[PDB]
Scaffold this active site. Structure first.
Site, PDB file in Angstrom:
ATOM      1  N   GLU A  11       1.130 -10.185  -1.335  1.00 34.41           N
ATOM      2  CA  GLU A  11      -0.428 -10.882  -1.729  1.00 34.41           C
ATOM      3  C   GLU A  11      -0.832 -11.247  -3.038  1.00 34.41           C
ATOM      4  OE1 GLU A  11      -2.342  -8.112   1.638  1.00 34.41           O
ATOM      5  OE2 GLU A  11      -2.674  -9.992   2.548  1.00 34.41           O
ATOM      6  N   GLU A  68       3.355  -7.429   8.873  1.00 35.91           N
ATOM      7  CA  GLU A  68       2.738  -6.884   9.242  1.00 35.91           C
ATOM      8  C   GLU A  68       2.575  -7.059  10.818  1.00 35.91           C
ATOM      9  OE1 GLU A  68       1.727  -8.099   6.178  1.00 35.91           O
ATOM     10  OE2 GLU A  68       1.012  -6.447   5.653  1.00 35.91           O
ATOM     11  N   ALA A  91       1.126  -1.410  -0.019  1.00 33.51           N
ATOM     12  CA  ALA A  91      -0.112  -0.067  -0.333  1.00 33.51           C
ATOM     13  C   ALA A  91       0.934   1.240   0.233  1.00 33.51           C
ATOM     14  CB  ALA A  91      -1.383   0.146   1.315  1.00 33.51           C
ATOM     15  N   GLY A  95       0.893  -6.320   0.350  1.00 34.57           N
ATOM     16  CA  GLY A  95      -0.100  -6.183  -0.595  1.00 34.57           C
ATOM     17  C   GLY A  95       0.477  -6.496  -1.877  1.00 34.57           C
TER      18      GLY A  95
END
Lengths: 259, 259, 259
Positions: free
Chosen positions: C113, C133, C65, C110
């Site tokens: 991911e 995270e 992000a 992200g």
């Protein structure tokens, strides 16, 4: 009389040594009772965030059920002991605390099932693991068939369980059963460093991720993603996630409180 | 006329050689019929406890569906043949007998799906495996997509199935598709030794563990543990588990009867 | 102004380069919007059959992000952005087009991911992947816990996610997170060759096999086999499967039309 475990407590990390070298660190009922109480204690607050479990000596991590005591136990006592052992493995999995098995020697039976119930495993050069129940006409009775298959897949699980062969440290590392290989004489240094790398992270976030991983297995993809998202929205409500943002913004280490 | 299989019977272990070198050991309906009858036979008692399946020669384990015979078969005959092939793979999995695929050469299509339906795999240096259906506009039709993914995971399965590439013996061993690698010329010696390591263990315990592994996949953890425990309580009722305890107490090899 | 992606279109294969080297190829809302539109486009016909996604430069595949833009976004805008990101990952999985992540550098958050939502991964020597995270008091919020565990199993997933350590290209290859390792300077040559090996196969068959693999996870064996067979019977109705038979009979390359 000496306790079943030596506890080396270092704040957020503890090392629990099975103090049973002369009996191959076997699981007597008294050993199991202490183990259950230790797990309940570290599971009841966020003071302790990682625990390393190991066996005394260089021959056995844990031989499984204590066969000397078995000679004093009736059928109903055996059944109640195996029930308690299963419940203790499940308590380890359900705990918010992270559990590292430091495999200093041979694991068999319930001792292997203990290592498999832990979150992570470190192998010394002498580490060996086996589920040899089929040699004696039974199958693993403390979750070993499922926990092994979930970790190494069905082909490798069938190999170990149907042949009843032991796997050594090198093969355990290659197939992912051991997450770390420690050099000769450095088992607990490696395991402790692994624990340090966990406990500097936020305890509710570690716990929630641990449970997301374990609880998602056996779900189809959309159900598993829904489960993860419920847990993500839960963790956003914690105070520690705000400390994480503040520490990042302030270019400093976070100091998490477990809330 | 010669049978589709050569059977080398050695009491609790049999070796079934697909006797079809000149047709790459392909699965004709007659080959499939013999295979089904052999599986039914060893599945109907505990006399036979491990079976090694291999192909004649050094080029093909099994090329899959016989494309010569396919030229004589109408659409409805193809469909009935694939139905029987699926049922035979499932019979192998549901059998109490353990099945070892000794991969002496190329496996493709239904021949790969046969190897995947077996409990364990041994690879000779010439072993190759492929699911190349997408090259021809279809997908594996005998369970190959699911059985491969369950064994090597979704990324490796997508690699093999979506690219339709063949995997060699070394890579098959590294990713766990082959449980053993045999040296040049020693395939059946290695496969037979693997079978020996199974059949000295108790047959109902081997069977029950095999089924616990396969039946637990796709269940969430608590359901899978409940399934294992039902099977543990079942196996405690066998006579062989008592022989296991007696043999252990008497420091001798067990002699199991399959009851 | 320059688009968020450079698109190198080569008929059935496209290469999408995140054109954001100076911001570590982070996912802004505008980057995410373009990504979603590209996925929708290639998912709406069978013209494009494989897509390689990569980041500009040699430092970052995708940092996750965009934290610069995050400073302009209220809580509700963050939530809507993460919802769109999840939907885009799921669109990649549900697409009939095959997606290859060519990991040219660090992936985090992200960005990791995204790589996990792709069908296959290629690692350059500088490739690194992390889900860090828990260091900041949260867990992966775009499916990373489930997608990682499905690919490398629960022990390796716990290792990476609970310790928040980064994995390098060599380890990613050994554990199957990277399907290919590319030599220095040859990332896109290797990724493109991988795409070529996919797109010469039939597009509906590739798609159906991709979905069979992903949709079977979490099902018990018989349910998963039933799912595969429904998809097999579906694919038999396509025109391309007839072209596959004709090309095989005529000893020529197939020319598939996506019908």
């Amino acid at each position: 009389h000496m306790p079943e475990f030596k506890v080396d407590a270092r704040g957020p990390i503890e090392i629990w040594t099975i103090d049973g070298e002369s009996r191959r660190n076997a699981i007597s009922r008294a050993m199991l009772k202490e183990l259950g109480e230790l797990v309940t204690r570290v599971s009841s607050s966020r003071d302790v965030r990682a625990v390393v479990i190991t066996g005394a000596g260089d021959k056995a991590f844990c031989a499984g059920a204590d066969l000397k005591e078995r000679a004093t136990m009736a059928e109903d006592e055996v059944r109640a002991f195996l029930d308690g052992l299963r419940r203790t493995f499940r308590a380890i999995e359900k705990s918010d605390c992270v559990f590292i098995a430091a495999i200093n020697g041979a694991a068999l039976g319930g001792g292997t099932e203990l290592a498999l119930a832990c979150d992570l495993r470190v192998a010394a050069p002498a580490a060996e693991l086996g589920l040899t129940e089929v040699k004696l006409g039974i199958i693993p009775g403390g979750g070993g068939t499922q926990r092994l298959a979930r970790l190494v897949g069905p082909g490798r699980a069938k190999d170990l369980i149907l042949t009843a062969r032991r796997i050594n440290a090198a093969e355990a590392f290659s197939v992912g059963l051991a997450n770390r290989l420690a050099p000769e004489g450095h088992l607990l240094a490696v395991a402790y460093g692994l624990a340090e790398s966990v406990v500097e992270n936020a305890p509710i976030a570690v716990a929630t991720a641990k449970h997301a991983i374990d609880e998602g297995t056996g779900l189809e993809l959309d159900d598993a993603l829904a489960l993860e998202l419920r847990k993500y929205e839960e963790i956003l409500k914690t105070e520690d996630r705000l400390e994480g943002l503040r520490a990042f913004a302030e270019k400093r280490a976070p100091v998490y409180k477990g809330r």
